[model samples]
Target: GPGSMTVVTTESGLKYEDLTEGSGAEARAGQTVSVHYTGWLTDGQKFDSSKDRNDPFAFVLGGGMVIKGWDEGVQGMKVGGVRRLTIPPQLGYGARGAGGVIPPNATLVFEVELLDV
Candidate 1:
């Protein structure tokens, strides 16, 4: 099975699993987070990567600046921790896709590393 690991409980269909535990306090909403992330489709097609640009992405948790999946998924992360998320379309880009990069209603997976909180 591909999803037997510990997962974050959510009302939405997002699933979170940790690949490595981090130290310090868990991430919470209203705090800015610096991170490196790689995102892909279920078929293994990489759609986005912050590491590819040599830039660590930063955003405020619970902010609407990102998708719903990220807003909920990144919670509880610690510094230096890594988490993998399985996000369904509703929590992602929804019906209208992000240009040509992501198809409409496409499920996405991401490997996210929390660098700072």
Candidate 2:
């Protein structure tokens, strides 16, 4: 084989960075969790947030209800923990794009706090 493409990987391409370590329980699959998050583009433009509404968002882990990046990245996070997720388009909206907020092949960044798990 000649000239095969070589790719590098870093932290599952999700770019998980913990801001605060939680004190309660670690996250797991098939469990419902509440979280507060602020979403932004790589350019630092604010897109959405749950805190603005004074309500945290809820979802079931590994249930295909959220983005692939969040599904994979939030694992092992503890309750009350805060983390940032850098999601590539493949693990996000991909080529189809998300509404008018996210463009095709766009990379998303989010500051998320786990309220419960």
Candidate 3:
């Protein structure tokens, strides 16, 4: 099944949006996370998501496969909680960016819901 992605908005940051505090980030490292989200650009341009499909995305925090921001932010999250995390370029795709959507040195916001453990 396909999973849904999330769109996140932040409030502070010199380099980018800095006032980012993930909603469900009350968890710990090595735990698993299942979420449904919608990811978009700072300009409201949706880049990727699974919400249109109807499934949930699942993964482990700091488990070697997911992104650095996710691995760090989702570490302390609990099940059934949501998070809006601001990802700095250092923790994201950096200068290269993932593709056309993730601009160079771009900061990202993600609204993720932790559905399971």
Candidate 4:
């Protein structure tokens, strides 16, 4: 039987659900992290994916290099863990979205897998 997992909402209005738990080191701010991720709009339209590029994306947690939701959501993730993030407009692209692929004030969804920390 298929069952839904519990969703955790943070004070910043970001929602997350852990798909797989990891036994490795937990990610923290200022640490470099590698991960694979797929992003989609609320309408289920696929926008971007690291897997599609065949390369894992690496970035510093809490860095402003990515969207606010990513910076907030990626924290506390352990290596080998998978998490799904539901990002509100403010935490996402906000009034100006990314290119034409994402709309203004769009609610984005992302499934991220932590590879390393």
Better of 1 and 3 by lDDT: 1
Relative to the true structure, candidate 1 reaches a TM of 0.78
What tens digits encode model 1's per-residue C-alpha lDDT throughout 27-115? 88888888888898878899889888989989888877666556655687789888787787767778887777777778888888888
On lDDT, the candidate that comes out on top is 4
Instruction: Give candidate 2's error at residue 65 in angstroms.
Output: 0.7
In model 2, the worst 10-residue window by lDDT is 3-12
Give candidate 1's total backbone clashes.
0
Clashing pairs in 4: none
Worst 10 residues of 1 by lDDT: 65-74
**Candidates' TM-scores?**
0.78, 0.74, 0.61, 0.77
Candidate with more favorable, higher TM-score: 3 or 4: 4
lDDT of 3 by residue, 8-96 (tens): 43333312222334444366666666776667677767676777777777776667765544554466555656555566665666778
What lDDT is obtained when candidate 2 is compared to the true structure? 0.77
Better of 2 and 3 by lDDT: 2
Error of 2 at 98 (Å): 3.2
Q: After best superposition, candidate 3 residue 107: deviation in angstroms?
A: 1.9
- Evaluate residue 72 in candidate 3 and report its C-alpha lDDT on the 0 to 100 scale: 45
